[PDB]
Structures are given as C-alpha cells and as structure tokens.
Amino acid sequence: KVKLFRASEPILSVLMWGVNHTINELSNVPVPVMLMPDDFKAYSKIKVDNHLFNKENLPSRFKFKEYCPMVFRNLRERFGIDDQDYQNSVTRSAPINRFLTTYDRRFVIKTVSSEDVAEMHNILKKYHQFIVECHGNTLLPQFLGMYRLTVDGVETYMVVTRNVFSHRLTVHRKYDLKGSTVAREASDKEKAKDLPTFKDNDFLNEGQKLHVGEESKKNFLEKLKRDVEFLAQLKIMDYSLLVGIHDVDRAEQEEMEVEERGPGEFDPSVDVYAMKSHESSPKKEVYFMAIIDILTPVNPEQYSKRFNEFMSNILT
Amino acid sequence: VKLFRASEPILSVLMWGVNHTINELSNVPVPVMLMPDDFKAYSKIKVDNHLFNKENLPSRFKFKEYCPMVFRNLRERFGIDDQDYQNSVTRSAPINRFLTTYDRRFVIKTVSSEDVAEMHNILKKYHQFIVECHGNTLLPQFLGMYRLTVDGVETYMVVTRNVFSHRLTVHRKYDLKGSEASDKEKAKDLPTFKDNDFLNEGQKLHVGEESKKNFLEKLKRDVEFLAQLKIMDYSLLVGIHDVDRAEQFGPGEFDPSVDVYAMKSHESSPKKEVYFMAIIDILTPPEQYSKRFNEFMSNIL
Ligand SMILES: Nc1nc2c(ncn2[C@@H]2O[C@H](COP(=O)(O)OP(=O)(O)NP(=O)(O)O)[C@@H](O)[C@H]2O)c(=O)[nH]1
Ligand SMILES: Nc1nc2c(ncn2[C@@H]2O[C@H](COP(=O)(O)OP(=O)(O)NP(=O)(O)O)[C@@H](O)[C@H]2O)c(=O)[nH]1
Ligand SMILES: Nc1nc2c(ncn2[C@@H]2O[C@H](COP(=O)(O)OP(=O)(O)NP(=O)(O)O)[C@@H](O)[C@H]2O)c(=O)[nH]1
C-alpha cells in the first residue's frame, strides 16, 4: 500500500505528497449541501520541516498550498471524477512530461504564474456557475485543482486539468488554432519535432478538414458558442482550440508492430472531447478538440467572434 | 470519517496529529534496524488553514513527533499495531492533563520540556533494554511523544500503555515507594493511597509462589537498569479489582495480551481479586533507592 513518492525531481515528489495529503484530509471533510462564498476565498496550507526522517524521496523541508479546496472538489465531482481516482492518478507513479501528465495520461498538470492564480480566483465563482448550468458539458478546461509548492524556498504554481487528448488513443497530428488575422504558422524547429504543434496557417495550407457528421458537429458548435460567449463576458482573450487527430489504421499498425516484438473506440465519460469521424469519411479517425489557455485577462468580443467563425469552418 | 471532535481544541490537534503521523509512517518502510539518527530525529508539521476545515480543528497549529522510527519500533516490540493505536486515539476523543483514549487502552500524560529532554537522554538505552528483555518488563511502555502548538502555546505529551485494565474496574489504588495520603486525597472517589497507608491497612497481594517469583525477577531487572541509568523518585502503581463488587460477558475475565500487567488472585486468597502492577514516573532525573524499593516490593506476596 506504500507510497514512496519517488520521482526524478523533488518538486514532483512534493506534488505527489501534496495531492495525497489534501485528498486524504478532504475525505474527512463532509460534502456540503452547497458552496459558500468563503469557499472561494479559502485555502489550505501545510509546512513540513522533518529532521533526519523520511528523507529518501521527499525533501525534509517543503510547503504545500491548495486553493479553494471545497470548490475544486465540487468541480471534480461535477466533472465525473472520483477523488480516490484523482489521487491515484497523481500518486501511484510520478507524473511525466513546465508541462506534465499523470503517469496514466488522464490528467494534465501545468505550472502557471502568480498572475494566473489571481485570474483563476477572479473567474472561479462564474466558471463554477457555468459548469453547473452546462452540467459539465463544455469545451473549456475542466479545472480539478490548483496548488502552490514551495521547495528550496521557491514557489511554483500549478493547475490540474483533465487531458484534452485520449488517455489511451494516440494522437498523430495536433493543431493550436486561434483564428488571428495575424499570420500564425509553425517554426521549422517545431515542424521537425516528433509531434509538431501546427498553427492556423499550417491547418489552412493543408486543406485539412474534420468530418464528424451533423449530430456531433451540432453538439460541438453549440458548446463553442456558449463557451466563447462566457470567455468574452469575462473579458478574456488569447485562448486557443487544441485539436488532436488520431488515425485508427495507423494505430492498428503501430500496435501490431509492438505485438510482433475496440479500434478507434473510446469511452466518452473519460475522453470527453473525443468524436468519431463520420461513417462516410475517407480515413477512419478520432478527433479531440477543446479550448485551452483561458487564464489571460485587440478586443474580447471580436476575439470570441473571429475564433468562433474560424472553428466553425474547420468542420463539415 | 474522522471529524476530530474533542472537548478542547488541543485534544482535536492531538487526534489529528496522531492520525497524520501514523498515516505518514505507513508510507515509510520498516528498516532492518534503527540507526543513530533515528534517536535524534523528529517530524514537524505546521497547519495554516483559512476559511476551511475549521469546524473541529483550529485553523493554525503545529505538531511535532519525536523519534518516529524509534517509537514505531517500540510499539511493535510491545505487540501494539499502528492502526490500532491510531484508532484508539482518533475514533473518539480522549477522556479524563492526564487522559486515556476512549477505550482506556493508552494513557496520555502531559510532561515538561525537562521530561522530554530526559527521555532523549535515556531513549537509546531504554530501547536496548526493551529489545533485551523482549518487551517483558514492568517499566512504562512508551508508545509516542509529541509537542503540540495551539494558540502559540507548546504542550508536550507522552503516550504509554495503561497500567490498569481497559475493561475491569479497579477498586483500590496504591502508590508505593518506601522511605501517606492527604485527608483531601482520602476524600476522593478513588484515592491514591501511598506506601504507609498500604502498610497501615495490612493490604496484601496473594499471587502464589509461581507468579510472585517471575514478577520479582522482572522487578529486580527493571530497577537495576533504572539505577544503572541513575533515575530516582519513581513509583510502583498497584490497582486492585474485586470481582464480587462488580457483580453487585464474565466476572474477573481479562485478556492478558491486552491488560499486560494483570495477575489473578491465588486460590488461597481470601477474596477473588485481580491485581495490576507496574513501575511509573521514571522521567525526572540513587542505586540505594533501587535496592530499598526492591525490598519494599519484595514483601507483598
Ligand atoms: N482574486 C484573488 N486573488 C487571490 C486570492 N488568493 C490569492 N490570490 C492571488 O494569487 C497570487 C498568488 O497567490 P499566493 O502566492 O498564495 O499569494 P500570498 O498570499 O502573497 N503568499 P506569500 O506571501 O507566502 O508569497 C497573488 O497575486 C494573489 O493576489 C483570492 O482569494 N482572490
Ligand atoms: N496532451 C495534452 N497536451 C496539451 C494540453 N494542453 C496543452 N497541451 C500541449 O502542451 C503545450 C503547452 O500548451 P499551452 O497551454 O498552450 O502552453 P503555452 O504557454 O501557450 N505554449 P508553450 O509550449 O510555448 O509553453 C503545447 O504543445 C500544447 O499542444 C492537454 O490538455 N493535453
Ligand atoms: N488509569 C491509570 N492511571 C494512572 C496510570 N499511571 C498513573 N495514573 C494515575 O494518574 C496519576 C498521575 O500522577 P503521576 O504521573 O503519578 O504524578 P505524581 O507527581 O507522582 N503525583 P501528582 O502529580 O498527582 O501530585 C497517578 O498518581 C495515578 O493515580 C495508568 O497507567 N493508568
């Protein structure tokens, strides 16, 4: 049952310790009938100074802070995430890659700035209400936790979100689309990487299209209009749509190749941004599409409109 | 769900801290042996909540556990499982500082800065004695040691296994040293009668030749060790439970693995009784006292 919190860096050990500690504490805290305003101004803070004890993986001295834990537990709940699963994903094995994924690819951990943490505080009450009235059906980031770590007297802010991508299905192309009138294409450097992060003009030059058929595409566009209206009404800009392309046949070959030494099927309760390609589409594919980078406080109404138009035009 | 509801915030912090340190320890591997640093080590945690989890705990407090590896090994060598110790402290608030856990298995005594210092001076030797007598001893069985800070005030506590039974009511109590009780204490419900009261009452404890020999062997070994460590002013705690009064699911029945200081009365004893006897108060810093104590304690069989 023993959790060593072994990780290649002490900050990752402290992260694992912290998620374990906060979730265990929370398991002794009753689930409220409702959130109260103080829950949105609340935090939990722990400071450890061990001496000649338990030094194999954790530092002897560290701090851990969890922002609005009652709120983020409610968020996890409204997103269909059990707390025991969440702690297991962060602590069973060290997260990998600052940008991390939990070892099981279910959750993403992004280090952020003090400013981002402030902006999250400013938007939390409204973001939470948006999640309750859209019943968790949104393309926005699903925020599950937010933490401050102190190791070596150095503070590190982190936000945990559900992965946009599948936790099991491989992503073969990815685009970061914003819709800027300004030219946005990928560097030859980025274009030489294993999975380049292609920008908008790369998408446009390729003649790329995503064929999902009428029903899924309607659900997607309705979410998109509501989501970017929300972002505009909060005076937020610079956000992107993350797009990941999974090629089913390519996956089948890659798997049979590792085997020498369901296909294109996924659980929507888990891969919440995933859509199958239309029955009559050239290659059988799975798409993952979500809004990302929503923490940055030129016009946000215009950004909403241009974004929604460009992302309307990447489907059929 | 462990709410840590307690009659004072300090008992809440104690419950919280014992729960926390024991849960952390279950994540720390059991070493092949204790190391010297284990005898100089501590864990320290400082909690600062804000608008959160304040229903029973304070929002700000500190908790320090001295030598967690050592005291975990002591618990093991005393036949006490960590989850059971944790349950006794945390399932329900401790009762009456001198406290017992809700089930009366363990005693929690508030102690001084000096006492904590003295335990640090004796710990390596006390542990070695424990391994060398296989836990078969009448000395206090130390299970943990903690410093709590609530409202900026530090409080030190030592947890021991109870001398008395956790189930059988004890009907008379004596504190024996050798060298009387107050009219005040003599008015309390259960007086602590001292040695001269025991002598004046003519109280005797008949355990028969067989049990009395091994008990005297342990007593001599313990008090010789205490002398070899230069400790004095300690006492022998004696408690007497009379079965027939309890009658006014069985009478005089007990688990020796739990009430480890308990002894049945001999067949050739007037009344049927149970005795609980162990050495207590060994923490405030001659050989002659060892000898005189062992003499007074020899002549009660
Ligand atoms: N709007 C809002 N911002 C907050 C809230 N809590 C923290 N922040 C912002 O989050 C940022 C980082 O938070 P944090 O590092 O915890 O700030 P701190 O309390 O100054 N900690 P320290 O003094 O130890 O460095 C700061 O810019 C702070 O203003 C809150 O409840 N609401
Ligand atoms: N698998 C996965 N990758 C993600 C997710 N969100 C972002 N990424 C990827 O991680 C990187 C960082 O994303 P982003 O939030 O936009 O960070 P950024 O600061 O704007 N860009 P930069 O890479 O220069 O730091 C990008 O390569 C992006 O494609 C996610 O939910 N899942
Ligand atoms: N139930 C129980 N009572 C105990 C145990 N150990 C001590 N006590 C009781 O609690 C009292 C605590 O006082 P003690 O630690 O002996 O300190 P003291 O200085 O010798 N006497 P005092 O402080 O009362 O003047 C003891 O006198 C005894 O009556 C134990 O293991 N179980």
Task: Respond yes or no: is residue A85 known to be catalytic.
Answer: no
Using alpha carbons, select from A192, A182, A1 the residue that is nearest to residue A88.
A1
Contact (CB, 8 A) for B255 and B193: no
Q: CA-CA distance, A249 to A305, in Å (whole number)?
A: 36
Same domain, A157 and A183: no
Q: Is the dihedral of CA A81, A4, B41, A49 positive or negative?
A: negative
Q: CA-CA distance, B88 to B261, in Å (whole number)?
A: 19
Using alpha carbons, select from B143, B168, B203, B193 the residue that is nearest to residue B276.
B168
What is the CB neighbour count within 10 angstroms for residue A70?
A: 21
Q: How far apart are the first and last CA of chain A?
A: 50
Contact (CB, 8 A) for A13 and A151: no
Region of A213 on the Ramachandran plot (φ > 0 left; ψ -120 to 50 alpha; else beta): left
Question: Which atom of ligand 3 is the closest one to the Cα of B190?
Answer: 29
Same domain, B29 and B49: yes
Q: CA-CA distance, A48 to A69, in Å (whole number)?
A: 19
Q: CA-CA distance, A156 to A64, in Å (whole number)?
A: 10
A85: three-class secondary structure by DSSP: helix
φ, ψ of residue B128 in degrees (nearest 5): -60, -40
- Of B281, B282, B283, B284, the one to substitute when testing ligand 3's pocket (max ligand atoms within 8 A of C-beta) is B281
Structure tokens at A3: 């959790």
What is the CB-side half-sphere exposure of residue A172 using CA atoms within 13 A? 16
Same domain, B210 and B234: yes
**Residue A42 touches chain B, beta carbons under 8 Å:** yes
Q: Is the dihedral of CA A114, A115, A116, A118 positive or negative?
A: positive
Q: DSSP letter string over A236-301?
A: ----EEEEEEEEHHHHHHHHHHHHH--TT---TTTSTTEEEPPTT-SS-EEEEEEEE-------HH
Contact (CB, 8 A) for B44 and A49: yes
**Residue B41 touches chain A, beta carbons under 8 Å:** yes
Q: CA-CA distance, B186 to B264, in Å (whole number)?
A: 27
Q: Which amino acid is at A184?
A: R
CATH of the domain at A171: 3.30.810.10
Distances from the Cα of B10 to the Cα of B2, B152, B156, B236, angstroms: 16, 12, 11, 30
Q: CA-CA distance, B106 to B14, in Å (whole number)?
A: 14
B2-6 long-range contacts, Cβ below 8 Å, gap at least 24? B2/A28, B2/B90, B2/B91, B3/A28, B3/B55, B3/B56, B4/A28, B4/B56, B4/B57, B4/B90, B5/B56, B5/B93, B6/B56, B6/B93, B6/B94
Using alpha carbons, select from A7, A29, A30 the residue that is nearest to residue A18.
A7
Determination technique for this PDB entry? X-ray
Distances from the Cα of B275 to the Cα of A294, B94, B168, B296, angstroms: 72, 25, 10, 17
Q: CA-CA distance, B183 to B291, in Å (whole number)?
A: 30
- Of B192, B238, B276, B284, the one to substitute when testing ligand 3's pocket (max ligand atoms within 8 A of C-beta) is B192
Which H or E run contains A83?
helix A83-91
Which of A5, A28, A29 best tests the B interface by mutation, with the highest count of B CBs <10 A? A28
Same domain, B12 and B81: yes
Distances from the Cα of B48 to the Cα of B53, B59, B65, angstroms: 11, 6, 18
Rg (CA), chain B: 20
Same domain, B227 and B113: no
User: What is the spatial order of strands in the sheet that A173-177 belongs to?
Assistant: A197-198, A173-177, A240-247, A285-292, A274-276
Q: CA-CA distance, A76 to A239, in Å (whole number)?
A: 23
Ligand 1 center to B15 CA (angstroms): 31
Non-local (6+) Cβ contacts of B58 within 8 A are B9, B12, B13, B47, B150, B151
Contact (CB, 8 A) for B284 and B115: yes
Ligand 2 binding residues, C-beta < 6 A: A 99, 108, 163-165, 174, 176, 197, 240, 242, 292-293
A129: three-class secondary structure by DSSP: helix
3-state secondary structure A43-79: EEEEEEECECCCCCCCCCEEEEEEECHHHHHHHHHHC
**Residue A60 touches chain B, beta carbons under 8 Å:** no
Using alpha carbons, select from A219, A216, A273 the residue that is nearest to residue A244.
A273
Task: Respond yes or no: is residue B177 known to be catalytic.
Answer: no
CATH of the domain at B116: 3.30.800.10
Same domain, B153 and B168: no
Distances from the Cα of B135 to the Cα of A134, B77, B79, B222, angstroms: 63, 6, 8, 11
> Residues B40, B46, B230, B233: which is the catalytic one?
B233
Using alpha carbons, select from A144, A181, A178, A172 the residue that is nearest to residue A68.
A144
> Residues A110, A217, A284, A305: which is the catalytic one?
A110
Same domain, B186 and B155: no
B85-88 long-range contacts, Cβ below 8 Å, gap at least 24? B85/B18, B85/B22, B85/B143, B85/B144, B86/B18, B86/B19, B86/B22, B86/B23
Same domain, A250 and A225: yes
3-state secondary structure chain B: CCCCCCCCHHHHHHHHHHHHHHHHHCCCCCCCCCCHHHHCCEEEEEEECECCCCCCCCCEEEEEEECHHHHHHHHHHCCCCHHHHHHHHHCCCCECCEEECCCCCEEEEEECHHHHHHHHHHHHHHHHHHHHCCCCCCCCCEEEEEEEEECCEEEEEEEEECCCCCCCCCCEEEEECCCCCCCCHHHCCCCEECHHHHHHHCCCCCCHHHHHHHHHHHHHHHHHHHHHCCCCCCEEEEEEEEHHHHHCCCCCCCCCCCCCCEEECCCCCCCCEEEEEEEECCCCCCHHHHHHHHHHHHCCC
**How far does CA B300 lie from the centroid of its chain?**
23
A177: three-class secondary structure by DSSP: strand
Same domain, B129 and B97: yes
Contact (CB, 8 A) for A139 and A182: no
Indicate yes or no: CB of B44 within 8 angstroms of CB of A48.
Answer: yes
Q: Where does a domain end: B115, B138, B162?
A: B162
**Most distant CA pair in chain B: distance in Å?**
65
Distances from the Cα of A177 to the Cα of A83, A244, A272, B67, B255, angstroms: 32, 11, 19, 56, 72
Q: CA-CA distance, A10 to A62, in Å (whole number)?
A: 10
Which H or E run contains A149?
strand A143-151
Using alpha carbons, select from A57, A249, A77 the residue that is nearest to residue A170.
A249
Same domain, A158 and A213: no
What domain range is B265 assigned to? 163-301
Q: Which amino acid is at B5?
A: R
Smallest Cβ–Cβ distance between A50 and the set B1, B43, B47 belongs to: B43
φ, ψ of residue A232 in degrees (nearest 5): -65, -50
Q: CA-CA distance, B140 to B156, in Å (whole number)?
A: 17
Same domain, A122 and A220: no
Q: CA-CA distance, A152 to A62, in Å (whole number)?
A: 7
Ligand 2 center to A184 CA (angstroms): 16
**Could you tell me which residues of B are annotated as the binding site for GTP?**
162-163, 173, 281
Indicate yes or no: CB of B53 within 8 angstroms of CB of A46.
Answer: no
Same domain, B191 and B139: no
Q: Where does a domain end: B147, B162, B177?
A: B162
Q: CA-CA distance, A257 to B46, in Å (whole number)?
A: 53
Q: CA-CA distance, B201 to B28, in Å (whole number)?
A: 52
Q: Is the dihedral of CA B89, A56, A8, A113 positive or negative?
A: positive
What is the CB neighbour count within 10 angstroms for residue B199?
A: 13
What is the DSSP pairing of strand B172-176 with strand B192-193? parallel
Contact (CB, 8 A) for A94 and A66: no
Distances from the Cα of A130 to the Cα of A83, A142, A235, A303, B262, angstroms: 21, 11, 15, 20, 65
Which H or E run contains A162?
strand A154-162
Looking at ligand 2, which residue's alpha carbon is closest to its atom 27? A197
Q: Which amino acid is at B102?
A: Y
DSSP state of A30: P
Structural domain count of chain A: 2
Q: CA-CA distance, B282 to B232, in Å (whole number)?
A: 7
Question: Which atom of ligand 1 is the closest one to the Cα of A67?
Answer: 6
Distances from the Cα of A125 to the Cα of A17, A118, A139, B54, B126, angstroms: 28, 13, 18, 22, 57
Q: Which residues of B274-286 are buried (b: 16+ CB within 10 A; e: fewer)?
A: bbbbbbbbbbeee
Contact (CB, 8 A) for A271 and A279: no
Please name every residue paired with B271 in a beta bridge, in sequence order, or none if there are none.
Answer: none
Q: Where does a domain end: A98, A131, A163?
A: A163
Q: Resolution in angstroms for this experimental structure?
A: 2.7
Contact (CB, 8 A) for B158 and B109: yes
**How far does CA A177 lie from the centroid of its chain?**
16
